[PDB]
Design an enzyme around this catalytic site. Structure first.
Site, PDB file in Angstrom:
ATOM      1  N   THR A   1      50.615  -6.862  15.155  1.00  0.00           N
ATOM      2  CA  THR A   1      51.265  -5.632  15.691  1.00  0.00           C
ATOM      3  C   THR A   1      52.092  -5.656  16.977  1.00  0.00           C
ATOM      4  OG1 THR A   1      49.706  -4.446  14.588  1.00  0.00           O
ATOM      5  CG2 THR A   1      50.807  -3.229  16.218  1.00  0.00           C
TER       6      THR A   1
HETATM    7  C1  LIG Z   1      49.282  -6.835  14.445  1.00  0.00           C
HETATM    8  C2  LIG Z   1      49.333  -7.553  13.111  1.00  0.00           C
HETATM    9  C3  LIG Z   1      48.322  -7.687  15.273  1.00  0.00           C
HETATM   10  O1  LIG Z   1      48.010  -6.992  16.496  1.00  0.00           O
HETATM   11  C4  LIG Z   1      48.721  -5.345  14.264  1.00  0.00           C
HETATM   12  O2  LIG Z   1      47.692  -5.074  15.159  1.00  0.00           O
HETATM   13  C5  LIG Z   1      48.201  -4.944  12.870  1.00  0.00           C
HETATM   14  C6  LIG Z   1      47.760  -3.476  12.983  1.00  0.00           C
HETATM   15  C7  LIG Z   1      48.210  -2.475  11.925  1.00  0.00           C
HETATM   16  C8  LIG Z   1      47.808  -2.891  10.545  1.00  0.00           C
HETATM   17  C9  LIG Z   1      47.489  -1.205  12.210  1.00  0.00           C
HETATM   18  N1  LIG Z   1      46.974  -5.643  12.497  1.00  0.00           N
HETATM   19  C10 LIG Z   1      46.704  -6.112  11.290  1.00  0.00           C
HETATM   20  O3  LIG Z   1      47.475  -6.062  10.366  1.00  0.00           O
HETATM   21  C11 LIG Z   1      45.318  -6.719  11.094  1.00  0.00           C
HETATM   22  C12 LIG Z   1      45.135  -8.052  11.832  1.00  0.00           C
HETATM   23  C13 LIG Z   1      43.801  -8.248  12.013  1.00  0.00           C
HETATM   24  C14 LIG Z   1      43.090  -9.049  11.164  1.00  0.00           C
HETATM   25  C15 LIG Z   1      41.733  -9.211  11.331  1.00  0.00           C
HETATM   26  C16 LIG Z   1      41.079  -8.576  12.360  1.00  0.00           C
HETATM   27  C17 LIG Z   1      41.786  -7.779  13.214  1.00  0.00           C
HETATM   28  C18 LIG Z   1      43.141  -7.624  13.031  1.00  0.00           C
HETATM   29  N2  LIG Z   1      45.116  -6.948   9.674  1.00  0.00           N
HETATM   30  C19 LIG Z   1      44.092  -6.496   8.957  1.00  0.00           C
HETATM   31  O4  LIG Z   1      43.208  -5.785   9.372  1.00  0.00           O
HETATM   32  C20 LIG Z   1      44.112  -6.916   7.526  1.00  0.00           C
HETATM   33  C21 LIG Z   1      44.522  -5.714   6.729  1.00  0.00           C
HETATM   34  C22 LIG Z   1      44.311  -5.976   5.275  1.00  0.00           C
HETATM   35  C23 LIG Z   1      45.143  -7.137   4.873  1.00  0.00           C
HETATM   36  C24 LIG Z   1      44.837  -4.801   4.543  1.00  0.00           C
HETATM   37  N3  LIG Z   1      42.780  -7.303   7.101  1.00  0.00           N
HETATM   38  C25 LIG Z   1      42.237  -8.513   7.197  1.00  0.00           C
HETATM   39  O5  LIG Z   1      42.758  -9.489   7.693  1.00  0.00           O
HETATM   40  C26 LIG Z   1      40.848  -8.647   6.666  1.00  0.00           C
HETATM   41  C27 LIG Z   1      39.960  -7.918   7.635  1.00  0.00           C
HETATM   42  C28 LIG Z   1      38.770  -8.726   8.138  1.00  0.00           C
HETATM   43  C29 LIG Z   1      38.374  -8.266   9.400  1.00  0.00           C
HETATM   44  C30 LIG Z   1      38.091  -9.183  10.388  1.00  0.00           C
HETATM   45  C31 LIG Z   1      37.717  -8.734  11.641  1.00  0.00           C
HETATM   46  C32 LIG Z   1      37.605  -7.382  11.909  1.00  0.00           C
HETATM   47  C33 LIG Z   1      37.864  -6.465  10.922  1.00  0.00           C
HETATM   48  C34 LIG Z   1      38.254  -6.912   9.683  1.00  0.00           C
HETATM   49  N4  LIG Z   1      40.641 -10.079   6.685  1.00  0.00           N
HETATM   50  C35 LIG Z   1      40.547 -10.822   5.583  1.00  0.00           C
HETATM   51  O6  LIG Z   1      40.546 -10.386   4.433  1.00  0.00           O
HETATM   52  C36 LIG Z   1      40.442 -12.313   5.857  1.00  0.00           C
HETATM   53  N5  LIG Z   1      41.075 -13.027   4.744  1.00  0.00           N
HETATM   54  C37 LIG Z   1      40.046 -13.824   4.073  1.00  0.00           C
HETATM   55  C38 LIG Z   1      40.638 -14.627   2.975  1.00  0.00           C
HETATM   56  O7  LIG Z   1      41.618 -15.499   3.535  1.00  0.00           O
HETATM   57  C39 LIG Z   1      42.720 -14.806   4.173  1.00  0.00           C
HETATM   58  C40 LIG Z   1      42.169 -13.866   5.259  1.00  0.00           C
END
Ligand SMILES: *[C@@](C)(CO)[C@](*)(O)[C@H](CC(C)C)NC(=O)[C@H](Cc1ccccc1)NC(=O)[C@H](CC(C)C)NC(=O)[C@H](CCc1ccccc1)NC(=O)CN1CCOCC1
Ligand SMILES: *[C@@](C)(CO)[C@](*)(O)[C@H](CC(C)C)NC(=O)[C@H](Cc1ccccc1)NC(=O)[C@H](CC(C)C)NC(=O)[C@H](CCc1ccccc1)NC(=O)CN1CCOCC1
Ligand SMILES: *[C@@](C)(CO)[C@](*)(O)[C@H](CC(C)C)NC(=O)[C@H](Cc1ccccc1)NC(=O)[C@H](CC(C)C)NC(=O)[C@H](CCc1ccccc1)NC(=O)CN1CCOCC1
Ligand SMILES: [Cl-]
Ligand SMILES: [Mg+2]
Ligand SMILES: [Mg+2]
Ligand SMILES: [Mg+2]
Ligand SMILES: [Mg+2]
Lengths: 233, 222, 204, 222, 195, 196, 212, 125, 195
Positions: free
Chosen positions: F1
């Protein structure tokens, strides 16, 4: 034992009726930082081969030097260096494949995935892959990294098997490659808009295109998307 | 799995492959990944097979009771809200990755839900192991103002990309079309491009080949 | 310390022309040590048959549990439970223990008494239903059974021919698995008769 | 930490007849859930009527085959163009494999050909060099699916003579090249159905006194 | 706790249980009775984790004795074994499971048959002609496979049991200080004092 | 983000990219990270998509219930509800939220709430992975009491650079304008902002 | 594996199974676990297949080189010590071998040496080696006497493997018998457990645990 | 290292260094070996130009290689010690690996092999 | 390998060493001699890691025998013990150390005195009236502190040794299958066949 620092993403390629096409973007990532933007990841060897490299850029630059030195070494005591005894794509590949496997066997790999695209002396298309593990394989379409997941599906719709190669023209093949590069820009977080493309044809020879850009992108529909579920405004 | 969802003129279409894996082994060659939450709200599911079935049946049950209570046809956002709050409560341990779609008095809708409880909105979506192969096709061929027949074609083509290029996906293509003002049509085995060829030999054994030690009649009656 | 492969065992079920067959081995061990050669893994509640592989304590526990539940079902419903309904009951009961599951691989088999249709189904340890026209496999030699069934099976087999096919599938799969074997049982199930046959197999 | 090994999937199969021997193997090459190539041969003619395949980690497999092919070449130089017998090749391969006992080639190796009496021969190796001559052997990802079927159909295991009260076994006999190729094709179509890493194409190499013939067959591409 | 054996013969069940109690590098006791009488015609031997074994055995004993008083009736060996299995089956998914393995030898007075049940700490029940827990089985099972017959007398069973103990004393690493042997038959439970 | 909110003469403007990632894969390239918790109180979401959505949904519920009893809540009140959730559940949350709202008395206000659950009232705020690359730029270029057009250019140029250097940021630049006039949504596509 | 060899009045009996496993996967049922070093020397194989197969065929080459250099057949003690000194050099490297060097010479008479991969070398009359060694011991010890006949000794060795083949999951396939005398070793056939178990069950009246 | 080939062939086909080593043996005090029906006897000469000798501590002419084998010699005394030491070490090494003492033939073969190695190794006489 | 004891009395040194060789849950042998004669009046017993023990003992034996041939003279027990200690002291800082503990019992012919040395795998040497390695010491040392006298005869030493073995057989967990006893005195080394 290594870890890759400055990295290059997907390299994509395919065969067509008279030759091969290969492409790769001009980015040198430093983790999530998109550090370097003027990085050339396609390296021509002679007028009949193009080596596309992804992965660690320091190791890529080492490989550049090896290929550069290979051309010099081949020219020594060789009156037919620009004719019958010129470097073939198959020679260049087997050399790299030998090095990659030797380095993995010493637990000190060149952290790369490599695609050697070219045309042999007899006119036959050459396209083969090799990586940090020394694993090699060939196919009508080859791609590294995210390209393997997103480009290959698109390129295989054009050339699904061997018999589809004569039926595929250079216009159709390049169009598919350029489309694949756009899709990678949409979906690969470590990709850039700027890229290079190379065509090695058995008739027209080596054509190296620099400073290409992804264009004709669809972003307009984004304005209609509001919220994440219920939100109307 | 490969699952997709595509919006069109007067509604929405979802599709899925029919492979169920157990490690590298194909357990079910023709399982149904399209689930009915309500008559006109359907759900495509990827991830942990038991979780996707269990969560979709639970919310589908509660949606039915809600529909009866309010004397109204259920809305996609209600299913969406109920699913995401359930999944979020379990912190990703319920491994359900869903594409939720349907029509209701508000209009036609298409959402995706992830196991941790995040939701996304879109005109075209894809989830599962073959989502990258599918999304490549969707990014290449999608456009605004698709017709019904164009959306079905695009959706099934996206699933096919997963079938052929992803080892996690295979077999057949299921489709469900949800158009506004009409009944939803569930097209089970819409495409079957992976039919097993005739075997070279019949392995029917001569009777008596197996050595037997005891026989006995089993009593099933009272 | 992998619950599903401590005791060992296998179950396989097939459909035929107006009939179903379910079969299992008889071994119960403790890793390398073979302990019992009389441990049957197929049970029945009315005309519905259930085979269960996996951790033996859960095999026994679940049998006792489904006997419990089907007995109450019959008292309230005033009829025997059907395979389609029982399959849903098994799935419900397993998913109830989602985050502390029974380490089992159950297999339902039977003929619906109303429609006369042959029915088989399989589950994973947390209750996901795997329905099939042809065959269901389960246990420590599931890979072997999948290979045997996929090659040997053909549709619409008569009860006598189906017996040979399912038996050969089980025996040869069990001989390539260290934790399976030590005897075998095959149930042939027709609309209103059920035959139970013990097979002769190598005892190593 | 750098992991020097990988799994390229695929499966191989060797059957020996009276005056012939076959060595089959699918042409699919994979990593994780992606397909690398639909046609990448891994069964090779090594000369002296010896066919070889080293399935598993392709890089190690290619290295091994390359080294054995080279061993054959130097055997001719050092011993007056003498033909390398299949039993001598097998022992030589053991020393190649065991030479890296403490950093193994991650491959299941199978070779096939004719013994010095002209009879069909198949030898199979583990990753560190233990070898054994057999009538029948499947190796690789789908070995566990194919092998028990071979025990039943090639060696007639668990099959008794009808009506003999399970006392007389079904007698062993050599199969024809036609009957063997039927079993190979059915084995691979079955493996393709139930294993995700197996498919695309089937390449069979047949070895008789006349030479080494090839046959290719399509397999499902999902 | 280590060695517990069981042999069902024609008219009785024989249980043999080691006498040694070892903690660290010291044999604290060499005359320990690793068994409890659950009812006049039912006997349970046990082996496993220290403390758990006796605590579990006595808990079962109390429950069976409570049943006997309530109904003025002795439970069948089959019924007692099922009760014991369920308790262990509950236990394995508890916060702290009982790590106890048991053999239940009993004489069913209604059937006029001896019965031997082997139940491990997971709640895995099997009826057997002969049984063992721990490393003992790795020697005795193969020995009994060879020498055991179903129509043997109690005296033949004791000689068969002597053969097992001798083999264990020869090939087992630890000194288990011999065994206490008890017989369960139509006349109840009695101990063999000279073994 | 990459997200930011900037106060100016007429009120406040919220800004954000549209990229959602799973590792290096872009799960959604047209995400809407600017979300309404009340008529004229919005927030920018960064961190976990699941956590931030769950939080924003609860806040919207609280402020709706607040309005039914006590009338329109202040922007400070909204930030306090966000803080309460983020602070009390700090061990189970990954959420970096910027709260921005328009009162008639207080005009434009911006509150930032980092991982810990602390509250910070500021003239403008930046957050998300891509914000690191524009601290220098934003500090040098921000001025108080800017016009609407100046603030739009400030946000556009800022997020353009954040997007350029951060792999985790990209897609379209969404903006939401909060003034006495009402609520206005703005969007800016790559072809425009990339060549700034 | 299960392998045994015992010394008795009429020389040495050696018996072994023929199963090879990779975890719970039964890889082979027809493995030769006895190596024929020379007309008077045998070697049994248990543990790592390759380690055993490679180093015991190597042992045979070293025994051949001894009789070329010394114009005399190598002693059982010397042969076993070549192997034990070899595996000792690799101690800690991860070799897995449980072998028994059996043979007859004039000076020694019938002799059995247990040799394993952690360097242990023991002379003895009775040894059982492998995953099912305890099951073989149970039957062998309880029926062993020095005064067994050649016929009874061959059967006891066969029966002991059968006992282990039955109970041990990682043992089975078939039994290979050998008898070593003053004149050298004699092969006494391959015996499939598939037929042998039922034949023994019926004739002997044992294995009552199994459903007949 | 010193590499020079000291033992080499001459035109007539002789290795003079080996033949001159025989002249050193011819100079040495006489040694005799006679074997009977159940015994062997080793006789040795000691030159009598050396009086005021201490026969307790003076190195004896006959040396035990093992408890069952003995070695006498003629020629350079200093050279003999090197052969005797090597032979004694090989005797214990044989007992260690073969679990049996050396035969007299084997010990002789070893000692002879050492002597030969010094006739075609560089840098040594 | 487990139990090795040593007792120095007036005119001799007595070494007792267990006969059991155990690997896993099987006693592979019950007649193992855990000792080597280094010279006519010097005996070394040993215990420790499998393979290492015999390899080390025989390596020492060969070296001492080589010395005896070279000098036509027997090394003193003190000299032999110092040589053995140095080898172990080198070993402990090697790539793979010998994990062997030894007792060296010898009769010094020049002093006309028996001598017992205890050396552990680190190269820690001590001369003692009585010694033990492993867990044996935890029982025998206190027992010998009480019953041992310096002027005892060989026969009194054997009775004192019987008292130790009995205590070990009573309180030790593992079955060590008795001991081989050897005596070292002015007349050399001999074995007690009935113990
Ligand atoms: C930018 C990208 C970084 O600051 C932004 O903040 C955005 C915010 C928007 C969406 C509001 N952040 C993200 O997109 C965020 C990045 C992230 C990832 C993990 C933890 C915290 C932040 N992405 C996500 O939350 C994605 C959204 C899904 C794809 C719709 N989710 C994941 O990555 C999930 C969540 C797991 C998780 C970890 C820690 C805390 C909360 C949730 N992760 C996976 O599914 C991991 N995956 C496993 C299989 O191999 C690939 C990765
Ligand atoms: C594509 C194919 C991959 O993403 C799709 O997404 C499909 C989804 C469709 C089926 C809805 N995914 C699967 O099919 C899914 C893949 C998978 C595998 C393992 C974990 C998570 C997801 N397959 C399954 O869930 C199978 C379904 C069977 C074939 C009916 N289930 C299993 O493999 C279970 C795993 C259960 C599980 C528990 C806890 C966390 C995660 C998964 N495995 C077993 O039952 C294995 N075995 C059985 C007996 O007891 C010992 C273990
Ligand atoms: C009884 C029969 C079983 O315990 C005996 O003890 C026998 C001795 C006979 C075979 C001489 N031992 C085995 O059967 C032995 C068990 C074993 C397994 C692994 C390590 C040590 C011991 N089996 C083997 O050695 C098998 C032989 C197979 C049947 C061809 N080989 C393997 O397990 C190989 C190589 C093992 C190995 C050792 C050291 C370094 C690297 C590898 N491993 C694989 O095949 C791996 N794997 C198997 C399934 O296919 C995917 C990869
Ligand atoms: Cl979001
Ligand atoms: Mg088996
Ligand atoms: Mg497939
Ligand atoms: Mg970017
Ligand atoms: Mg077995």
């Amino acid at each position: 034992t290594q870890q890759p620092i400055v990295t290059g993403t997907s390299v994509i390629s395919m065969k067509y009726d008279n030759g091969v096409i290969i492409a790769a973007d001009n980015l040198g990532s430093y983790g999530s930082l998109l550090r370097f933007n003027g990085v050339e990841r396609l390296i021509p060897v002679g007028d009949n081969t193009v080596v596309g490299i992804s992965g660690d850029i320091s190791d890529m630059q080492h490989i550049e030097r090896l290929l550069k030195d290979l051309v010099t070494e081949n020219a020594y005591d060789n009156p037919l260096a620009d004719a019958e005894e010129a470097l073939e794509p198959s020679y260049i590949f087997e050399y790299l494949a030998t090095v990659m496997y030797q380095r993995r066997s010493k637990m000190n790999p060149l952290w790369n995935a490599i695609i050697v695209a070219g045309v042999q002396s007899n006119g036959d298309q050459f396209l083969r892959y090799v990586n940090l593990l020394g694993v090699t394989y060939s196919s009508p379409t080859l791609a590294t990294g995210f390209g393997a997941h997103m480009a290959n599906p698109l390129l295989r719709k054009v050339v699904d098997r061997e018999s589809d190669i004569p039926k595929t023209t250079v216009q159709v093949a390049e169009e598919a490659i350029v489309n694949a590069m756009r899709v990678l820009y949409y979906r690969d977080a470590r990709s850039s808009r700027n890229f290079s493309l190379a065509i090695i044809d058995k008739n027209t020879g080596l054509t190296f295109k620099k400073n290409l850009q992804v264009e004709n992108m669809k972003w307009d529909f984004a304005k209609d998307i509001k919220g994440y579920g219920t939100q109307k405004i | 799995t490969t699952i997709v969802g595509v919006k069109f003129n007067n509604g929405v279409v979802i599709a899925a492959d029919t492979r169920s894996t157990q490690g590298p082994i194909v357990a079910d060659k023709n399982c149904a990944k399209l689930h009915r939450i309500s008559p006109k709200i359907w759900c495509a599911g990827a991830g942990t097979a038991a979780d996707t079935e269990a969560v979709t049946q639970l919310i589908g049950s509660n949606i039915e009771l809600h529909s009866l209570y309010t004397s109204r046809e259920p809305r996609v956002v209600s299913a969406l809200q109920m699913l995401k709050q359930h999944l979020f409560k379990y912190q990703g341990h319920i491994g359900a990755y869903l594409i939720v779609a349907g029509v209701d008095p508000t209009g036609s809708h298409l959402f995706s839900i992830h196991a941790h409880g995040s939701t996304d909105v879109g005109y075209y979506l894809s989830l599962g192991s073959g989502s990258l192969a599918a999304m490549a096709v969707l990014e290449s061929h999608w456009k605004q103002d698709l017709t019904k027949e164009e959306a079905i074609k695009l959706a099934s083509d996206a699933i096919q990309a997963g079938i052929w290029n992803d080892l996690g996906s295979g077999s057949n293509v299921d489709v469900c079309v949800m158009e506004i003002g009409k009944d939803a049509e569930y097209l089970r085995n819409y495409l079957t491009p992976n039919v097993r060829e005739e075997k070279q030999k019949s392995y029917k054994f001569p009777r008596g080949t197996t050595a037997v030690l005891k026989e006995s009649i089993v009593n099933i009656c009272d | 310390s992998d619950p599903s492969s401590i005791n060992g065992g296998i179950v396989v079920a097939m459909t035929g022309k107006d009939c179903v067959a379910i079969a299992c081995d008889l071994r119960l061990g403790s890793q390398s040590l073979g302990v019992s050669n009389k441990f049957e893994k197929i049970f029945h509640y009315g005309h519905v048959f259930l085979g269960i592989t996996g951790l033996a304590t859960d095999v026994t526990t679940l049998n006792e549990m489904f006997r419990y539940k089907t007995n109450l079902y019959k008292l309230k419903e005033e009829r025997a439970i059907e395979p389609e309904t029982f399959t849903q009951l098994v799935s419900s009961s397993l998913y109830e223990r989602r985050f502390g599951p029974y380490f089992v691989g159950p297999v339902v088999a039977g003929i619906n008494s109303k429609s006369g249709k042959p029915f088989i189904a399989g589950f994973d340890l947390i209750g996901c239903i795997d329905e099939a026209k042809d065959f269901i496999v389960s246990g420590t030699a599931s890979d072997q059974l999948f290979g045997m069934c996929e090659s040997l099976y053909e549709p619409n087999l008569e009860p006598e021919d189906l017996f040979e096919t399912i038996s050969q599938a089980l025996l040869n799969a069990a001989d390539r698995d260290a934790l399976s074997g030590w005897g075998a049982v095959v149930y042939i199930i027709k609309k209103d008769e059920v035959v139970k046959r013990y097979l002769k197999m190598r005892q190593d | 930490q750098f992991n020097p090994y990988g799994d390229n999937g695929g499966t191989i199969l060797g059957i020996a007849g009276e005056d012939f021997a076959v060595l089959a193997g699918d042409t699919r090459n994979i990593t994780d859930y992606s397909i690398n190539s639909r046609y990448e041969p891994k069964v090779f003619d090594c000369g002296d009527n010896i066919v070889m395949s080293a399935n598993g980690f392709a890089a190690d497999g290619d290295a091994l085959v390359k080294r054995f092919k080279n061993s054959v070449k130097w055997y001719h130089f050092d011993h007056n163009d003498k033909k390398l017998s299949i039993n001598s090749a097998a022992r030589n391969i053991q020393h190649l494999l065991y030479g890296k006992r403490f950093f193994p080639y991650y491959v299941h190796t199978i070779i096939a050909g004719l013994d010095e009496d002209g009879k069909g021969a198949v030898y199979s190796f583990d990753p560190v060099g233990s070898y054994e001559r057999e009538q029948c052997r499947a190796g690789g990802a789908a070995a566990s699916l194919i092998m028990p079927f071979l025990d039943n159909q090639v060696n007639f295991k668990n099959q008794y003579e009808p009506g003999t009260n399970g006392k007389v076994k079904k007698p062993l006999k050599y199969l024809s090249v036609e009957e063997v190729i039927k079993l190979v094709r059915d084995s691979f179509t079955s493996a393709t159905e139930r294993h995700i890493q197996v498919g695309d194409g089937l390449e069979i190499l047949i070895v008789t006194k006349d030479g080494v013939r090839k046959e290719f067959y399509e397999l499902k591409r999902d | 706790m280590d060695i517990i054996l069981g042999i069902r013969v024609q008219d009785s069940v024989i249980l043999a249980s080691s006498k040694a109690v070892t903690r660290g590098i010291s044999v604290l006791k060499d005359s320990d009775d690793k068994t409890r009488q659950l009812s006049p015609h039912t006997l349970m031997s046990f082996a496993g984790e220290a403390g758990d074994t006796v605590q579990f055995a006595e808990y079962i004993q109390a429950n069976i004795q409570l049943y006997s008083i309530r109904e003025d009736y002795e439970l069948s060996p089959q019924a007692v074994s099922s009760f014991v299995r369920q308790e262990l089956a509950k236990s394995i998914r508890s916060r702290r499971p009982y790590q106890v393995n048991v053999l239940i030898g009993g004489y069913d007075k209604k059937k006029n048959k001896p019965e031997l049940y082997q139940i491990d700490y997971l709640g895995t029940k099997v009826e057997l002609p002969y049984g063992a827990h721990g490393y003992s089985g790795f020697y005795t099972f193969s020995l009994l496979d060879h020498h055991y017959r179903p129509d043997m007398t109690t005296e033949e069973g004791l000689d068969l049991l002597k053969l097992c103990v001798q083999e264990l004393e020869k090939r087992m690493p630890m000194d288990f200080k011999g065994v206490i042997v008890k017989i369960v038959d139509k006349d109840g439970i009695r101990q063999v004092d000279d073994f | 983000t990459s997200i930011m909110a900037v106060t100016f003469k007429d009120g406040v403007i919220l800004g954000a990219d549209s990229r959602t990632t799973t590792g290096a894969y872009i799960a959604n390239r047209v995400t809407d990270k600017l979300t309404r918790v009340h008529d004229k109180i919005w927030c920018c979401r960064s961190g976990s998509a699941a956590d931030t959505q769950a939080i924003a949904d609860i806040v919207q519920y609280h402020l709706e219930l607040y309005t039914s009893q006590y009338g329109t809540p202040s922007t400070e009140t909204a930030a306090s509800v966000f803080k309460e959730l983020c602070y009390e559940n700090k061990d189970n949350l990954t959420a970096g939220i910027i709260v921005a709202g328009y009162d008639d008395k207080n005009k434009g206000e911006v509150y930032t709430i980092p991982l810990g659950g602390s509250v910070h009232k500021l003239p403008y705020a930046i957050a998300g992975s891509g914000s690191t690359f524009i601290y220098g730029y934003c500090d040098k270029n921000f001025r108080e009491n800017m016009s609407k057009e100046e603030t739009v250019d400030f946000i556009k140029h800022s997020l353009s650079q954040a997007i350029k250097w951060d792999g985790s940021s990209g897609g379209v630049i969404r903006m939401v304008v909060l003034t006495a006039a009402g609520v206005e949504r703005l969007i800016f596509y790559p072809d425009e902002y990339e060549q700034l | 594996t299960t392998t045994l060899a015992f010394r008795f009045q009429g020389g040495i009996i050696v018996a072994v199974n023929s199963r090879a496993t990779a975890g719970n996967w039964v890889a082979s049922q027809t493995v030769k676990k006895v190596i024929e070093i020379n007309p008077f020397l045998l070697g049994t194989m248990a543990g790592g297949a390759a380690d055993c197969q490679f180093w015991e065929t190597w042992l045979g080459s070293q025994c051949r080189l001894h009789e070329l250099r010394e114009k005399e057949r190598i002693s059982v003690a010397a042969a076993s010590k070549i192997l034990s000194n070899l595996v000792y050099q690799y101690k800690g490297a991860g070799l897995s071998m449980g072998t028994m060097i059996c043979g007859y010479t004039r000076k020694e008479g019938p002799t059995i040496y247990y040799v394993d991969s952690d360097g242990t070398r023991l002379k003895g009359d009775i040894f059982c080696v492998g995953s099912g060694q305890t099951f073989a011991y149970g039957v062998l010890d309880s029926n062993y006497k020095w005064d067994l006949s050649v016929e009874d000794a061959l059967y006891l060795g066969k029966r002991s493997i059968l006992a282990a083949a039955h109970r041990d999951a990682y043992s089975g396939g078939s039994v290979n018998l050998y008898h070593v005398t003053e004149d050298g070793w004699i092969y006494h056939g391959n015996h499939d457990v598939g037929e042998l178990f039922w034949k023994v069950k019926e004739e002997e009246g044992s294995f009552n645990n199994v459903i007949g | 290292g010193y590499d020079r080939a000291l033992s080499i062939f001459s035109p007539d086909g002789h290795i003079f260094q080996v033949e001159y080593a025989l002249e050193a043996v011819k100079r040495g005090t006489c040694a005799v070996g006679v074997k009977g029906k159940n015994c062997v006897v080793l006789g040795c000469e000691r030159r009598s130009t050396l009086k005021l000798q201490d026969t307790r501590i003076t190195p004896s002419k006959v040396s035990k290689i093992d408890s069952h084998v003995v070695l006498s010699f003629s020629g350079l005394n200093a050279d003999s010690r090197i052969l005797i030491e090597k032979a004694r070490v090989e005797a214990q090494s044989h007992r260690l690996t073969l679990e049996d003492p050396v035969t007299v033939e084997y010990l002789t073969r070893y000692v002879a092999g050492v002597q030969q190695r010094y006739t075609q190794s560089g840098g040594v006489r």
